[PDB]
Amino acid sequence: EDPHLRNRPGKGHNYIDGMTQEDATCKPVTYAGACSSFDVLLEKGKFPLFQSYAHHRTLLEAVHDTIIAKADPPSCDLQSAHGNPCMKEKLVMKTHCPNDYQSAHYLNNDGKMASVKCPPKYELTEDCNFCRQMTGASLKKGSYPLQDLFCQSSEDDGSKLKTKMKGVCEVGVQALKKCDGQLSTAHEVVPFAVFKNSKKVYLDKLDLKTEENLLPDSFVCFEHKGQYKGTIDSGQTKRELKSFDISQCPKIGGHGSKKCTGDAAFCSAYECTAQYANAYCSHANGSGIVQIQVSGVWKKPLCVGYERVVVKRELS
Numbered sequence: 001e002d003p004h005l006r007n008r009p010g011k012g013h014n015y016i017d018g019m020t021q022e023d024a025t026c027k028p029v030t031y032a033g034a035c036s037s038f039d040v041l042l043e044k045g046k047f048p049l050f051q052s053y054a055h056h057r058t059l060l061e062a063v064h065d066t067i068i069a070k071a072d073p074p075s076c077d078l079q080s081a082h083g084n085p086c087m088k089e090k091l092v093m094k095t096h097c098p099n100d101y102q103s104a105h106y107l108n109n110d111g112k113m114a115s116v117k118c119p120p121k122y123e124l125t126e127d128c129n130f131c132r133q134m135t136g137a138s139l140k141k142g143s144y145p146l147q148d149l150f151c152q153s154s155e156d157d158g159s160k161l162k163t164k165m166k167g168v169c170e171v172g173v174q175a176l177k178k179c180d181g182q183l184s185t186a187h188e189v190v191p192f193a194v195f196k197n198s199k200k201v202y203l204d205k206l207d208l209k210t211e212e213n214l215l216p217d218s219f220v221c222f223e224h225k226g227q228y229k230g231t232i233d234s235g236q237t238k239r240e241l242k243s244f245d246i247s248q249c250p251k252i253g254g255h256g257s258k259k260c261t262g263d264a265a266f267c268s269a270y271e272c273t274a275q276y277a278n279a280y281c282s283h284a285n286g287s288g289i290v291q292i293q294v295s296g297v298w299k300k301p302l303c304v305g306y307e308r309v310v311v312k313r314e315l316s
Contacts (some may be wrong), residue, residue, distance in 0.1 A: 001053060001054065001220075001284055003236045003239075004116060004220040004284065005054055006029055006060070006243075007030070007220035007221070008028060008030070008057075008061065008243070008244050009056065009103075009284075010031055010065040010173055011061065011064055011065055012030065012061060012243070013027050013064035014028075014029045014035050014038040015027050015037060015060065015064075016037065016060060016075075016103055016105055016115060018074070018117075019141060019175040022037070023140045027119070028243070031239065031242065032225075032242075033304070036142030036144075037058075037060055037142030037143055037144070038060075039146060040098075040144065042054075047145075047148045048148065048226070049150065049304075049305065050149055050305075052053065052286060053150040053181050053290070054150075055217075055220070055286055055287040055289065056286075056290070057151040057152060058149070058150070059105065059113060059147075059149055059151060059303070060143075062113075062151035062303065065150055065153075065297065066112070067152070067154075067302060068107070068112065068151060068302065068303065069111075071085075071108050071112035071114035072085070072113070072114075073085055074115065075116070076114065076115070076116055076118065077118070078118060078130055079119055080130045086108075086114050088173065088275065089106075089108055089114070090106075090116055090129060091129060092173060092309050092310050093307060093308060093309050094127075094308040094309070094310075095127060095146050096127070096128075096151075097125070097127070097128040097144050098125040099123060099138060099223050100123055101140050101144045102122065102143075103115050103116070103117045103142070104116050104117075104121075104143055104144035104145070104146050105143045105144070105146060106146040107147060107149065107194060107200065107305065109173050109174065110199060110200075111194040115180060116128060121134050121139070121194075122204070123135070124144070130145075138264060139293060141279070148305055149303055149305030150304060150305070151302060151303040151304075152289070152301075153165060154195070154298075154300045155196065155300075156195065156196060156299050156300035158195025158196055158197065158201075158301075159196070159301065160196075161195055162201060163176060163201050163202045163203075164176070164295060165202060165203070165204045166204060167314045168311060168313050168314075169313065169314060170311065170312040171202045172202070172310065174202065174308040179292060179314045181314055183312040183315070184312070185310065185312050186310070186311055187308050187309065187311075188308070189307070190202050190305050190311065191203045191304070192306070193292055193294070193302075193304040195300075201294060207293035208290055208291070208292050208304070209290070209291050209292075210286070210289065210291075210300070211288050211291075212287070213289065214269050215261065216246050216247065217284075218284055218287040219246055219262070219281045219282060219283055220243075220246070220281070220282050221246045221262075221279045221280070222242065222243060222244050222279060222285050223264075223278055224242075231274060231277065232278070232279060232280040233274075233280065244278070244281075246281060249270050249271075249272065249279065249281060251271070252269060258279060259273050259279075260277050260278065260280070261277050261279075261280050261281070262281035263283055265283045266282070266283065290304070292304060
């Protein structure tokens with residue numbers, strides 16, 4: 001995990017649909033290169049959740065791997081007559097966009113991916129609510145991630161599931177009940193999740209558990225880029241590592257187009273050859289099937305995250 005963060009589960013596609021010019025280095029993300037939609041997820045202290053579950057998918061990876069659908073209108077333009085579809089939802093979130101972003105993206109209350117967006121040569125203001133003429137010569141080429149989040153594949157149905165928080169009148173968009181009285185208001189960093197046929201379900205607590213397993217996404221595989229340097233051996237520095245697709249590796253008593261080796265876990269399911277290996281495969285720390293307890297019950301979510309939103313609570 002430590003040196004294999006840029007070795008992504010699935011495709012590893014970190015770009016937003018209207019924004020191609022950075023694909024040579026974000027489609028896929030890998031050990032080499034920079035990516036303005038992704039490198040930002042790895043500055044420590046920011047994005048702590050995703051950092052802990054780093055070998056699960058980003059939101060952009062979720063959509064390109066068809067786990068998450070794109071919102072009805074994929075992006076909202078702040079400059080217009082208004083730009084209203086996103087606006088309501090965006091204003092309830094408190095966000096800090098760096099300079100030079102034309103886009104920024106988030107899971108909407110509907111569970112789709114929406115983005116907030118400026119016309120060409122216009123950037124997002126520090127709070128991400130407005131567009132203004134750019135001030136360098138360079139716009140970044142990504143979209144900026146607005147929540148702290150990871151995603152996975154799931155078929156566990158959650159249409160029965162819904163936000164409930166104790167004495168909360170409002171959280172983000174969601175009105176939970178009517179509070180006649182005087183309310184305390186604050187921006188809180190609120191955990192949430194979305195499931196198959198659900199909307200965003202905000203939560204009082206985050207209670208997660210993980211089953212580790214030996215499925216393909218629980219490994220990261222690498223090889224030497226370049227001319228032949230001898231065996232591949234879990235050598236981490238002096239690296240010209242590219243990423244490597246584990247499906248090429250033969251399972252025990254199976255066909256495969258390449259030759260492989262790996263750690264003990266790997267050699268328990270896949271065949272291993274130290275000498276002739278094209279690639280070495282490691283087990284990814286903190287990978288697996290995540291479930292979440294939604295007030296009494298364990299369910300397998302599509303995505304889980306944190307979001308800084310306005311919360312109104314009754315007193316007493």
